[PDB]
Ligand binder design. Structure first.
Ligand SMILES: [Zn+2]
Length: 46
């Protein structure tokens, strides 16, 4: 076999809440904030 696609370009910091992608880490934090806050119970039925 032949594979190895780990090293083409430059890693990036993408959000883990929504799934957005950013070039810089700090820049991402400024966004992730939007997620910072309260969250729903979960079992919300309806
Ligand atoms: Zn996000």
């Amino acid at each position: 076999g032949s594979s190895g696609s780990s090293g083409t370009g430059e890693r990036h910091y993408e959000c883990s809440e929504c799934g957005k992608a950013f070039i810089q880490k700090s820049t991402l934090s400024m966004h992730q904030r939007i997620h910072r806050g309260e969250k729903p119970s979960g079992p919300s039925s309806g």
